[PDB]
Amino acid sequence: NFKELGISDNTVQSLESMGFKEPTPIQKDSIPYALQGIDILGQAQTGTGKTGAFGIPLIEKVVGKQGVQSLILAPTRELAMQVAEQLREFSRGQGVQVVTVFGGMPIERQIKALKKGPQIVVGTPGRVIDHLNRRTLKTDGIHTLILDEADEMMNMGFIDDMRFIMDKIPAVQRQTMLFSATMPKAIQALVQQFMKSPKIIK
């Protein structure tokens, strides 16, 4: 169960309340490794429980810390919103802020949210780069970087954006996770250059 995987009591209560009675296979396989700080390469698709697989240990990692601690990249506004909603449910009542940054709104609204130093930022690669270029997303405290559906981000033209983000965020103290159903050459290059010999989970 989630307790036996190493998850704290308050987070487990929140998971139970959202209907997570038992971990999924990918959560059982990933979570103990994610908690150990190891880089993870997940070959998984929606339906597996992959949001919980990265999100649950991320909550355990950032709770009680200050400033932007983690960045999750998603291919679409819709997936970003869904991931952010789940993370807010996981972390219910523990003082964790989650901020979403994607296109379609003026960037001023997001800048204001980022000034408060949310522990978790979830965004699309293009919008994230806008904040990096404006210095409104500080990378100095970012200790976890998650690429959700890396193949889909590449299908939408974001490979250079992903490369840039992975190069710009300091790597030595960073834990990186990459989830993707397919791994074409461009994605394999990201793993080889920007990750630390990740554990492969299938």
In the complex with ligand AMP, the residue whose CB is nearer, 76 or 139, is: 76
Of the candidates 11, 14, 30, 51, which one interacts with ligand AMP according to CB under 6 A? 51
Of the candidates 11, 50, 62, 175, which one interacts with ligand AMP according to CB under 6 A? 50
Of the candidates 8, 10, 43, 46, which one interacts with ligand AMP according to CB under 6 A? 46
Structure tokens at 42: 């997940």
HSE at residue 149, side-chain half, CA atoms within 13 A, is 22
Q: Minimum distance between the CB of residue 91 and ligand AMP, rounded to whole angstroms? A: 15
In the complex with ligand AMP, the residue whose CB is nearer, 51 or 69, is: 51
Structure tokens at 17: 């309340």
Question: Quick one: 43 exposed, middle or buried, by C-beta within 10 A (0-12, 13-18, 19+)?
Answer: middle
CB atoms within 10 A of CB 166: 19
Instruction: Determine the interface stretch with ligand AMP among 30-38, 48-56, 113-121, 129-137 (rule: CB under 6 A).
Output: 48-56
Site string for ligand AMP, 5-44 (x = CB under 6 A): --------------xx--xx--x-----------------
DSSP string for residues in 87-98: HHHHTTTS---E
To 5 degrees, how large is the angle CA 152–CA 196–CA 119? 70
Which residue numbers belong to the known binding site for ATP?
44-51
Each residue of 117-154: b (16+ CB within 10 Å) or e? ebbbbbbbbebbbbbbeeebbebebbbbbbbbbbbbbb
Residue 64 within binding range of ligand AMP, rule CB under 6 A: no
Residues of this chain that interact with ligand AMP (CB under 6 A) are 19-20, 23-24, 27, 46-52
